[PDB]
Amino acid sequence: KFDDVCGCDEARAELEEIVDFLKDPTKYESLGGKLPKGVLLTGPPGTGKTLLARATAGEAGVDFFFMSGSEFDEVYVGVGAKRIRDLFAQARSRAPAIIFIDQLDAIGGKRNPKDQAYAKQTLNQLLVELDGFSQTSGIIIIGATNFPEALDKALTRPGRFDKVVNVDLPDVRGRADILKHHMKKITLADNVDPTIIARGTPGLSGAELANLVNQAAVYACQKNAVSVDMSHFEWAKDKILMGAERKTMVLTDAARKATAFHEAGHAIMAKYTNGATPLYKATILPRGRALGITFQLPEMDKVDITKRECQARLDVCMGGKIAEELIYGKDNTTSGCGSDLQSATGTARAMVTQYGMSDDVGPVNLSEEWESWSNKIRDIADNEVIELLKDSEERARRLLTKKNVELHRLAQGLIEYETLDAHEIEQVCKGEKLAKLKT
Amino acid sequence: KFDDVCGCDEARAELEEIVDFLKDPTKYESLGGKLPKGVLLTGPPGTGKTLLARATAGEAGVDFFFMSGSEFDEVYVGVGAKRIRDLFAQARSRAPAIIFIDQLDAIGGKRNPKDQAYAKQTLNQLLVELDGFSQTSGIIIIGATNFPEALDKALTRPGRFDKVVNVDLPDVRGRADILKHHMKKITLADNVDPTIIARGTPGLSGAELANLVNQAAVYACQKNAVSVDMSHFEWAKDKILMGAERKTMVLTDAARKATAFHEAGHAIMAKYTNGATPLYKATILPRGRALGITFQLPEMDKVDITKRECQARLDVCMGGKIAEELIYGKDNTTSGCGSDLQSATGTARAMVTQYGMSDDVGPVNLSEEWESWSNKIRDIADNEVIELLKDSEERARRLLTKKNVELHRLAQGLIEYETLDAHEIEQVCKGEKLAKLKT
Numbered sequence: 059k060f061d062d063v064c065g066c067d068e069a070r071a072e073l074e075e076i077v078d079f080l081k082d083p084t085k086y087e088s089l090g091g092k093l094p095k096g097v098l099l100t101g102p103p104g105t106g107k108t109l110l111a112r113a114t115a116g117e118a119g120v121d122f123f124f125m126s127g128s129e130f131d132e133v134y135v136g137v138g139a140k141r142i143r144d145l146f147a148q149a150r151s152r153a154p155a156i157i158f159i160d161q162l163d164a165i166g167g168k169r170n171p172k173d174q175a176y177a178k179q180t181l182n183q184l185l186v187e188l189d190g191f192s193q194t195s196g197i198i199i200i201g202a203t204n205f206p207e208a209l210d211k212a213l214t215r216p217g218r219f220d221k222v223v224n225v226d227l228p229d230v231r232g233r234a235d236i237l238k239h240h241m242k243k244i245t246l247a248d249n250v251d252p253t254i255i256a257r258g259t260p261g262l263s264g265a266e267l268a269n270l271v272n273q274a275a276v277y278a279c280q281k282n283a284v285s286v287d288m289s290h291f292e293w294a295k296d297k298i299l300m301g302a303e304r305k306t307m308v309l310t311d312a313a314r315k316a317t318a319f320h321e322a323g324h325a326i327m328a329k330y331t332n333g334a335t336p337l338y339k340a341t342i343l344p345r346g347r348a349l350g351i352t353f354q355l356p357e358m359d360k361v362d363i364t365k366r367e368c369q370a371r372l373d374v375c376m377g378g379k380i381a382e383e384l385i386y387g388k389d390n391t392t393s394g395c396g397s398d399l400q401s402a403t404g405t406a407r408a409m410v411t412q413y414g415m416s417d418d419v420g421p422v423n424l425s426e427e428w429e430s431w432s433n434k435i436r437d438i439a440d441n442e443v444i445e446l447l448k449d450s451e452e453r454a455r456r457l458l459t460k461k462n463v464e465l466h467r468l469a470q471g472l473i474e475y476e477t478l479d480a481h482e483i484e485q486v487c488k489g490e491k492l493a494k495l496k497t
Numbered sequence: 498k499f500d501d502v503c504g505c506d507e508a509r510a511e512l513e514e515i516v517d518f519l520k521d522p523t524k525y526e527s528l529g530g531k532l533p534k535g536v537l538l539t540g541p542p543g544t545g546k547t548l549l550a551r552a553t554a555g556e557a558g559v560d561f562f563f564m565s566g567s568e569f570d571e572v573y574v575g576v577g578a579k580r581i582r583d584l585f586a587q588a589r590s591r592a593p594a595i596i597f598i599d600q601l602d603a604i605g606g607k608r609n610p611k612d613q614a615y616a617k618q619t620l621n622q623l624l625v626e627l628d629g630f631s632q633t634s635g636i637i638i639i640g641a642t643n644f645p646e647a648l649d650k651a652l653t654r655p656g657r658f659d660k661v662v663n664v665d666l667p668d669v670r671g672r673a674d675i676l677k678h679h680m681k682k683i684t685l686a687d688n689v690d691p692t693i694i695a696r697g698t699p700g701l702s703g704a705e706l707a708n709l710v711n712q713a714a715v716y717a718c719q720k721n722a723v724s725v726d727m728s729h730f731e732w733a734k735d736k737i738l739m740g741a742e743r744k745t746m747v748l749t750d751a752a753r754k755a756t757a758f759h760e761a762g763h764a765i766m767a768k769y770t771n772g773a774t775p776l777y778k779a780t781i782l783p784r785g786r787a788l789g790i791t792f793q794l795p796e797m798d799k800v801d802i803t804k805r806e807c808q809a810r811l812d813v814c815m816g817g818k819i820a821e822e823l824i825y826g827k828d829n830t831t832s833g834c835g836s837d838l839q840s841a842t843g844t845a846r847a848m849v850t851q852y853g854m855s856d857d858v859g860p861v862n863l864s865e866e867w868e869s870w871s872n873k874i875r876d877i878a879d880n881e882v883i884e885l886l887k888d889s890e891e892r893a894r895r896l897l898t899k900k901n902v903e904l905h906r907l908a909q910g911l912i913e914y915e916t917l918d919a920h921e922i923e924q925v926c927k928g929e930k931l932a933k934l935k936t
């Protein structure tokens with residue numbers, strides 16, 4: 059039923075109206091209303107699509123005729139047409155039913171005539187027998203593929219598959235309810251907040267959330283612990299998101315204090331800056347890819363970005379370079395800070411070449427045809443991007459020149475404890491002992 | 498049947514002439530006439546061109562052979578031409594047949610001589626099939642294209658495509674006929690004036706009218722209504738014009754307020770400016786693919802806007818950003834105003850280059866061949882595009898400083914009601930009650 063699927067409500071709604079056709083056809087038939095023969099399920103791969111068709115067919119009283127397309131590439135065909143007419147003939151025997159077809163690209167496709175001959179024979183067997191039934195009091199074919207490009211053109215004609223619905227990647231409460239639905243099978247520990255890790259994986263599927271819960275339950279289960287707390291879930295989250303953990307790295311103390319001032323710079327002026335996304339777990343662990351990460355947890359839309367949040371994240375992307383300038387002098391800035399620079403540059407161009415956030419260019423969209431404009435407007439636009447980043451590093455220079463005490467406290471706090479929460483960062487910046495085993 | 502194509506009386510008269518030629522040759526072949534070897538239908542998408550072809554074919558008793566131009570994959574070298582040789586090869590075995598080629602402008606384009614080997618093998622095979630060495634008898638080719646000016650000189654030669662029937666977009670007395678025809682298929686309508694919906698929807702085509710009617714019938718089915726009344730036609734009409742409504746997930750007083758100020762800006766600019774098209778509705782709901790939308794709609798159908806209308810468009814597309822800066826200050830202008838600047842950019846740039854509405858540039862067309870022109874002229878042109886947009890936002894600011902009370906009124910009532918047609922806005926702007934229910 060519609061309880062088993064989690065998230066994806068904008069597809070579930072049109073599925074309950076088409077199922078409102080499905081359990082009572084004669085009402086929609088008596089007035090002259092018509093609805094398409096078969097609907098098309100698209101979207102990213104593996105977002106709970108077969109569970110939408112099984113959920114519709116399961117909550118209604120109907121039969122669910124499942125068949126895959128890729129299984130027609132297992133053998134030479136000509137017989138696949140015969141099992142298709144077996145399938146639709148059996149569907150006309152059991153008149154309240156729906157017919158789900160998985161990976162429709164393998165039935166269709168645009169191929170060489172040596173195999174487009176009989177592949178076209180099974181294909182237009184499907185095309186003929188999509189026409190060999192009256193729509194009245196009949197059956198609705200549901201077809202699903204994640205590649206709308208690979209589908210055959212003649213199969214997508216009016217008189218055939220018409221209404222196209224999208225099954226996309228879920229939002230924050232969608233991932234919260236998917237994560238809860240997979241939490242309903244393992245042994246949890248305490249107040250395990252699903253919404254603190256629901257946001258935290260921005261734009262990822264549902265099956266990978268099953269990998270998150272599954273690998274986290276494995277990792278708790280080999281430690282011979284009691285249950286699965288928050289540490290296991292954020293452990294497997296920080297494995298699937300970035301990468302594994304290097305327990306074999308032997309590194310000096312100058313490097314540890316250098317990256318300590320880098321992460322302390324990002325953490326401080328990510329913390330004290332007007333408008334930023336609030337602070338979260340900062341570390342200096344080499345988590346696979348990077349060496350020291352600051353985490354940040356927002357919960358709004360990106361449409362609610364503004365000029366204050368854009369200048370806020372431009373000030374977040376200068377704390378490392380300005381921290382390493384103000385501590386170690388000028389001629390000792392490293393190169394990894396330059397990686398942070400590219401994120402800054404991206405945001406800066408969106409403040410000039412898409413929005414109206416620059417009073418010297420004018421209100422325009424310079425982004426969709428950049429090559430069309432001449433050189434003078436690109437000089438004014440690129441110049442405004444340059445003074446935007448210079449003003450960002452000037453504000454970062456002063457707000458880290460007047461917060462030096464928290465920079466050293468949070469710095470050697472990251473040297474001694476090497477993992478801090480925002481509550482714990484607040485305890486470090488006040489000069490307070492924080493009741494935790496050091497490392 | 499020719500009755501099924503309601504609207505397009507004169508073009509249908511033209512094809513009726515050909516069917517009359519087929520049904521008794523001797524009346525027309527008595528002075529030396531012959532069948533036109535080719536007829537080319539022109540007109541925008543979905544105006545009923547294949548409908549006419551199936552009218553002649555299915556009405557005159559000859560085999561109809563469909564083939565689409567946007568179906569030729571062009572992944573390999575040989576197929577495409579092989580499809581044409583097979584298609585014509587099978588059509589000659591059914592001598593009085595008809596061959597319909599849809600979207601010629603996808604395969605038959607300009608034969609640029611500097612195309613290496615394989616771009617124009619299909620077009621050459623087509624040319625040799627239409628008017629080649631061995632003659633064809635009793636075959637009629639009907640080619641439906643949207644851009645007659647894009648086809649090449651060789652394919653539109655008198656001898657391959659004899660006539661050029663123009664099926665243009667329907668007018669009000671035509672739309673009344675289409676609506677009458679498709680409403681006729683419904684068995685039940687209580688009291689509905691087709692000229693109401695016909696005068697209400699300028700610019701729509703035959704297909705959008707057909708699914709207007711069908712969506713109204715289905716919508717009457719869902720609500721378990723007894724009939725098909727005018728409110729249903731209004732729901733389906735607003736659906737097709739403004740976009741499919743989406744169930745309101747969530748909102749806050751802040752987001753809802755800011756949005757109400759945005760569409761309040763577009764709506765006030767739409768009303769009080771001069772030259773703008775009339776106003777239809779303002780909405781605070783998430784309709785279609787946008788957060789609220791103020792839809793304008795002309796009373797009469799115009800072929801081309803003058804300078805005052807387009808300057809009116811430039812002034813209307815600044816109400817969002819200017820309203821949000823008057824209310825929420827400069828530093829809070831969101832990034833949802835990107836589409837406004839995209840559209841306004843398009844309008845101004847088509848004003849300067851194509852339409853020839855600027856004096857320091859001159860009476861010259863710079864749109865096509867944009868690469869060839871030098872950098873001097875591009876500098877002047879882009880200078881006047883940007884100057885024109887800056888001036889537009891100047892006017893929108895200076896007007897929305899004069900309409901604070903109307904702005905806050907319409908925004909507040911728009912919060913309270915979530916939807917408003919132009920009359921209700923006219924009442925709300927003067928502080929009057931609307932006689933309906935809050936929220």
Ligand SMILES: Nc1ncnc2c1ncn2[C@@H]1O[C@H](COP(=O)(O)OP(=O)(O)O)[C@@H](O)[C@H]1O
Nearest residue numbers: 502503504542543544545546547548703704707
């Ligand atoms: N003159 C007309 N009379 C009746 N229906 C029309 C007319 N023109 C377009 N339509 C409608 O448009 C829809 C699409 O028809 P089609 O022939 O596929 O469009 P096109 O030939 O422009 O691609 C049909 O449902 C048809 O009812």
Ligand SMILES: [Zn+2]
Nearest residue numbers: 759817834837
């Ligand atoms: Zn807008």
